[PDB]
Amino acid sequence: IVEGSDAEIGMSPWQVMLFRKSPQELLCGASLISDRWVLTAAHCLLYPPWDKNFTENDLLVRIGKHSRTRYERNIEKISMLEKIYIHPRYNWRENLDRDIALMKLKKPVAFSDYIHPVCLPDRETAASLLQAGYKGRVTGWGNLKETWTANVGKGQPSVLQVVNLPIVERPVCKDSTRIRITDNMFCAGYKPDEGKRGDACEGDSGGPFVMKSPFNNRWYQMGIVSWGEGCDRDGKYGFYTHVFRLKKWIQKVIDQF
Template identity: 30%
Template structure:
């Protein structure tokens, strides 16, 4: 009995060490961008529009996902997304406008080189896709979708969660922002080799983006602009649904503020990237990823009889806590079995 109580305490305390063994209660706590130095390309007002992006190291963008489809001529990276819970990836609805069979699609997490994902990468089959019911393909309004995975994700140093900001976060005041996406490596041969790259960007006032010399009113209130007035750095083909993340101004936390949605051309002057604002859809996201929020347990009424001396009181645990305990117990039993063998 003492061993069981010890295992239960371990389950409640959570993992020990430098990694998380599940995706519970953590998001954006480790920087999705490790290198905040000037080495990451950033456009300055005196520069010409010739910005470039940099390859990233494994474990730098831990929440980013490659959404792929298998066709008769091979498997292809189609869009990007971000893991936001142990079963859900957030992406753009336009990625699935022609998707007839989701079973041909998959999600790859923890990879920086899609040609050589490495041992840290994980592949998940898609259970279902939930596009926003008001998504309009022509205007790209409400361009957001949730992808449910067949199996839950186990977090690691290479796979962690992105944080969707709620209404308490002043997104417009965030100063340090980044984009990432897969690009064909110039050294790749004989075929294209997609590697993850990143770049620093700035949030641009939507009113400026909607001015006559920019987008002329085409940007919707639920969208963000990010990039530089003279262009040079931008998202492009294959980046749809990809993350726009910004560092919190006071905490060591990164917010997933946008999903790459659309733009006119790539990296053109006065045509920055347009991103779906995740904050605007926070309630919609929670409605599906947290459909049954836990209710506070009522205070038990006093009983006439107290537990007998030496007995364990009858304690009711939430189902998730019990499942975590059983998983820990199974791991411990397997460890003891291996040692005895």
Template identity: 30%
Template sequence: MLGLKFSIVAICLTLSLQWIGPVDSKVCETHDKKIGKCLRPKDCPALKPIVDKMNKKIPLSEIERKLTKLIVRCEKKKKFCCEEPLNSEGLNLLKENDDICGNFADLRVYNARKIRMGSRPWMALLEYNVTQPFRARFQCGGTLITSKFVLTAAHCIKETLVSVRLGEYDISEPLDCLMIGNKKTCLDGPLDVPVDKKITHPQFDNFFLYNDIALLRLQDPVRITDWIRPICLPLSLELQLESQTNILMEVVGWGLTEQNALSNVAKKGFVNRLPLTQCNIFNIADKRICASANGIDACQGDSGGPLTYPTSYNGKQRLVQVGIVSYSDGKASDCGQLPHAYYTDVAEYMGWITETIVEKE
């Protein structure tokens, strides 16, 4: 995961390095049980900013100081175990939206309240070509992450999935409008974009729902507007660490409500992140988030939607997506009555996301 510049700077930190015995010169295990590579510090993007700050005698943040204590040294001298870096081209595609991503207009899903119109412009609805009433054709959610890709859950990927709807608020209304004083403000109207390619994670397990993450490539790039814009993702090491320790999070979707009916208007609710052991998960390498679900819960129809939290992103208050609605242990009728629910941990898949969104054909 991390590396150090093996120089005079590194001498000050050698006492905090963990030695875990012989490690293969190419493949290693980081302190948090992730697969990494033994790299020279200059080849480890995750830690390079920290080393640069130390060389310039710039004080480290509290999180950065903690990170230096978790470094795993490889058997070969001058190399440290570094989590595989993000795809630079894919990372740049995501960073193109740094100035506009995650902007929200206000701070349930089950037993929740409606979001403000236009306040979550990254929300997507997945539409399936099935012989059901119009409202029932929208069975999953997702989030726009670039002008051409939508992030969702792998279990939402079906042959009947045909398009993605963006810029929606109330599914029952052809045009969403809101009176602000004496002025009427309307959204531009929902945009339905055909899906060009469905990409599920190669290790997705449909039975246990491991690696429950997928990307949808849209047929055409969408035009970014006030009502259609991407969500922020945890691109930096600091954001990834913060996202995995944050407690209070927001879940949004058009799924089943306490009236056991699909909601026409997207709703939001707040849940608390729980330790995996509290959810009977004892494998610390597990790539899921466990969150509280008593009274407020994602439900059927919310799958693929985002779990987010507000934080400072490039110095501005933004919402960052940390999870994807995956599943709970009970039936749809149990929503809001179970102790916890599970979400795919987005931070664990940033390498796959940045690799996959790079056009290869």
């Protein structure tokens, strides 16, 4: 997360860390959507141009975390994966279309002050909130700046980072990039004329873009950090998987499994 701030304790209790067993590595973020199901980006698990194809046994989900690096004894919970489900029409070529995956945990996780699921939107919540100018919130332990030889200082945060970012109109998203965008994506971030900063960055993928509903006081996950070009660049926006657009696949997987 670039130009965000440290999360408060329990501020994002649905945040999940996808953690590699060997070597130890932050692979991606993710989100808790029930006591046994975790949502993430497909490319966190499968991305052939980078020789990435993980199995269930290669990774762990760590829930309730704040520190990036500590083992937060009696605070975080570590869960093993029973099965990964990648969207059957995920397209890693091209433009990461339908960049979404589910992971079923081997055992249900107990909820706590630090661990609690986020809601998925229904059609009214998505129509009410997914509108240009409305801000959502992105969280992660990914890079604090676009990687660059000229950077000075620590590149990864001590604790979970948070940034609030406005949704951008689809034609502006489209025209900002030569990468082909689709209706399975939306973009967010400040426009040049707003003179502000903030973005997701490498290492944040899979984490949630959430919005608060004034209709019922609940937080909803509208997006998944998916891709961008650099981080916090002038004239660019971050791109997010559109969760509501892919919700029927989510529901199919959870109802079948």
